[PDB]
């Protein structure tokens with residue numbers, strides 16, 4: 653389907669059915685969006701919310717986080733697993749305090765230079781908190797695009813990764829970028845699931861190639877054996 657129809661149908665779906673009341677979606681800032689993205693990378697939303705609230709109460713600003721002892725950050729992280737994320741979280745807070753005056757940087761290159769922040773997380777921070785015109789590509793988003801446009805191939809091959817980034821740029825609009833990027837995460841998390849997707853609930857069902865052929869299991873490709 654035409655990219656302008658993809659974006660319009662996802663935005664109309666988000667308006668009526670999307671998630672808008674998570675704590676990191678209200679009175680949004682770059683700091684709140686970065687902290688939530690790091691916690692969500694390897695942990696489900698229901699488990700993250702109490703940790704997000706405890707971190708914002710103890711560390712109201714990125715300078716408070718930077719000046720705290722690392723052992724206190726690791727103690728508050730206990731139960732989230734994947735603690736390389738917490739070691740990098742503290743180093744990134746120290747980089748913002750030291751290079752950027754305690755104010756989150758607003759250019760793609762300076763955000764992506766932070767430890768623990770790659771290409772997709774950088775675009776998420778700048779689009780969701782300030783409305784800058786960048787697309788995202790985490791596992792949820794990649795599954796929706798690979799099924800709708802029939803992208804086989806393992807995304808761990810560079811040519812396949814590059815095709816998925818170009819597709820994401822093509823369907824992501826500038827007007828409503830914050831709504832669109834959250835809506836793509838909601839679709840992959842709750843509707844276009846790994847097993848047995850809920851196509852009847854999906855706003856792309858009228859143009860999706862996997863839905864038309866009942867072939868969702870082929871997309872994205874798996875690692876070769």
Ligand code: SF4
Pocket residue numbers: 796799800843844845849850851854855856857860861862863868
């Ligand atoms: S129609 Fe089905 S397979 Fe296609 S993007 Fe939606 S949930 Fe995924």
